[PDB]
């Protein structure tokens, strides 16, 4: 509305991870509180790698309303990014899969329900079959 003006600072390209590390300054007059990923899709065009090798977290809204501090991370690789992207940022972006194991209180008791087994336990399971009801 009033030139959101993606401007970039501290543009440091890492050669040993095939990426760039940089701090985004965002001054956005007359319209605030945009998005995670619209600014990436405007940043991923000016850096010419792809659309979705960029990893943002930020848009720390500065006081007043109209200025923010972002922090994106474009990589210089597409599929090799997912080998080293943080997986919580990937499930924020939806390209990867969200894991779903049990919660805390079901898993650690399952460790307690793991030591009581003798071996693979089916020697007991044959014996608790025969006896009961004997």
């Amino acid at each position: 509305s009033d030139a959101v003006t993606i401007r970039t600072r501290k543009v440091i390209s890492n050669p040993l991870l095939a990426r760039k590390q940089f701090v985004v300054d965002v001054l956005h007059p007359n319209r605030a509180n945009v998005s995670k990923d619209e600014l990436r899709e405007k940043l991923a065009e000016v850096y010419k790698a792809e659309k979705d090798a960029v990893s943002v977290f930020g848009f720390r809204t500065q006081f007043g309303g109209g200025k923010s501090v972002g922090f994106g991370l474009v990589y210089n690789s597409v599929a090799e990014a997912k080998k080293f992207e943080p997986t919580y940022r990937l499930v924020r972006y939806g390209l990867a899969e969200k894991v779903e194991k049990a919660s805390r209180q079901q898993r650690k008791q399952k460790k307690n329900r793991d030591k009581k087994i003798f071996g693979t336990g089916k020697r007991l399971a044959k014996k608790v079959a025969r006896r009961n009801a004997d």
Binding site: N14, P15, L16, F84, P86
Partner: protein, 260 residues
Amino acid sequence: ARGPKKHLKRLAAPHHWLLDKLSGCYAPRPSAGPHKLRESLPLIVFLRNRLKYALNGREVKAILMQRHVKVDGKVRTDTTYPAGFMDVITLDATNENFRLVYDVKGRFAVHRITDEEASYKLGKVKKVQLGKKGVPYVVTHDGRTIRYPDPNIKVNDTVKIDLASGKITDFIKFDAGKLVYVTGGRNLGRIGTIVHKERHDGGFDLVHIKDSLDNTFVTRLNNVFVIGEQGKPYISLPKGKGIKLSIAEERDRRRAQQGL
């Protein structure tokens, strides 16, 4: 008591790492090290905080699996692997070469050196000895002993290394006008190059040390280390040039850095 301590928190490593206070956590504990105390630093403190290549602790461990780290041609995929003094942390692709020196403000350095000249360290000796079945040897910063050295050099000098192994080349003594260099302490590592020694036979050793400030001071022997012939030095010194420039004109120099 009862065993080693496989943790230490922050506030217990000294200022020269420049960590954060309100992380509210345990410090990077150095692993068992070849060279020296926790007044050294592990490599992850050199990367993610001085050189600033990463944020996550998962992240910095993931660089080392790609095999880009290298000291001396040795692999060393240990995360918190300690780093000695003047032991060049060369790299793979990204091609940089960092020598471990001391700047003029307490902590160590972020200093690049060239591709050539990065294939040698510089080695303080601490113990020369004839030992088992007539095999002479020296020791180093890391204690990397070297079979069949230059005979009868002495303890307490510096040693050039050939990096296929030790394969020592040149002895550098201490005389009335050479290079010496502090390593550790309150006034660690600027230059004083020499002015005049003493001994104090029996208890401790002191050395008079004359800066480019052109007064003197005295630091004890275990920080004393020789570089080489005067005005030569084997390592390109970092961009503070070893003065302890005084605070009254530290302030007059830094607004003459900004130009106002």
